[PDB]
């Protein structure tokens, strides 16, 4: 009773196909390398004196 | 008062019959063998690359 009328039809599909790249028409993943500086300066105190 | 008007009658049985054969002609539990094979793919993956 709960199959009464079921017809099941195959209509389409998708493929799973990788391009081996020998001629690497691809890009990747980029890699770069920048530099950070940061500037360390140092000041003076007030000074100790003995008389 | 309970057990008033109680009757009780037989209607049949069943028994265990074996046949004990000797020419035999039992098919009794055959035993077979046979396999199922996989096969496993190993696919490529998309590049890395500096340029």
Redesign the interface.
């Known amino acids: 009773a709960a199959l009464s009328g079921l017809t099941v039809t195959g209509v389409g599909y998708s493929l799973e196909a ?1 391009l ?2 020998i001629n ?1 028409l ?6 770069d390398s920048d530099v950070q500086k940061q500037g360390f300066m140092i000041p003076t105190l007030p000074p100790l004196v003995i008389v």
């Open positions: 990788r081996t790249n690497q691809e890009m990747g993943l980029l890699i």
